[PDB]
C-alpha cells in the first residue's frame, strides 16, 4: 500500500517471471512469494545500527523475528500480492487475481482467522508503541517535558505488554525506562523552579505540574521493587519537596505545598491515574521509519 512496497512487489514479480519458462500467473506467484520471503528473511537476519529497525519496514520481518507460523506469513504475503493497487499494471494484474483466488481457498484448519488477526494486531501495537516512543523522545529533545511524559508512559506500558508475548516483540527496555524516568525528574525540577519563583503565575504552573502530572503518575515508578533507579528517583523527588519545610515558609505557599505533599509521600491508595493516553497522528511507514531514525540519531 506504498510506492516503495508496490514497486518492490512489481519488481519481485518481474524477477520471478524470469525463473521458469512457464509464465502462468500461478507459477509466477509461487516464485514471487518465495523470492519476497527470502528478501524479507535477509532483512530479518541483518545486524542493524540503532537508527534502523527493519521490523518497522514490513510486517513479515516482525513475523520472522517473532517466529510466527509459516502459514500466517504465507497468507500475509498472498494479501500483498492480492492487493487492489496491483490491479492496473499489466505485469501484476493476473497474479493479483490468482492471489485473491488462493486467499479464498485457505481453510480454517490451515490458518485460524483469530490467530491471523492476533498477529497483525501485535504488529499494529508495535507500530503504535514505536510512534509513542518517537513523539515522547521528540518532545524530550525539545525540552517539552509534559508532552514527552504522557507519550513515554504509553510507550513504556505498551512495550512491557508486547515483550510479555516474546523477546522480539518490542523495543529496548533500558532506553524507554531511562527517558521515562529522566522526563519525570526534569518535569519535577521544572515544577520546583516555578514553585520558588515568587511570581504567582509561575508558582501556579509549578503546582499544576505537581497536582496534574507528578502526583498522579508517581505510582508508576513504584510498581516493581526490582526497578531500583525508578525507586531512587521517587525518593529524590520526595526529598526535593520536603526540603522546603526545613525552614520557615510563607504561609500561602506552605498551604499549597501541603495540599499535595501527603499524596506525593504516599501514593499507595491511587496507583491508577485513569488518565487517557494521548492520541496518535496518522502516519505512513516511510514517516515512521524516518522519524525513528531521526530521533535515534538525535539522542540526548
Ligand atoms: Na537496529
Residue numbers in the entry: 749 to 1048
Show sentences the authors wrote.
The evolutionarily related deubiquitinating enzymes (DUBs) USP25 and USP28 comprise an identical overall domain architecture but are functionally non-redundant: USP28 stabilizes c-MYC and other nuclear proteins, and USP25 regulates inflammatory TRAF signaling. USP25 and USP28 share an identical domain structure and highly homologous catalytic domains. USP catalytic domains are usually around 350 amino acids (aa) in length; however, in USP25/28, the catalytic domains span ∼550 aa due to a large, conserved insertion of unknown function at a common insertion point between USP boxes 4 and 5 (Ye et al., 2009). Active enzymes form distinctively shaped dimers, with a dimerizing insertion spatially separating independently active catalytic domains.
A C-terminal region comprising ∼340 aa of unknown structure and function, yet with high conservation, is shared by USP25 and USP28. We embarked on structural studies for this domain, excluding a C-terminal peptide in USP25 (aa 1,049–1,055) that facilitates an interaction with tankyrases to mediate their stabilization (Xu et al., 2017). A 1.7-Å crystal structure of USP25 (748–1,048) was solved by ab initio molecular replacement (Bibby et al., 2012) and revealed an α-helical domain without any similarity to previously reported structures in the protein data bank according to DALI. C-terminally extended USP25 (aa 157–1,055) was exclusively tetrameric, indicating that the C-terminal domain does not affect oligomeric behavior per se, as also found for USP28. In full-length enzymes, a C-terminal domain with a previously unknown fold has no impact on oligomerization, but N-terminal regions affect the dimer-tetramer equilibrium in vitro.
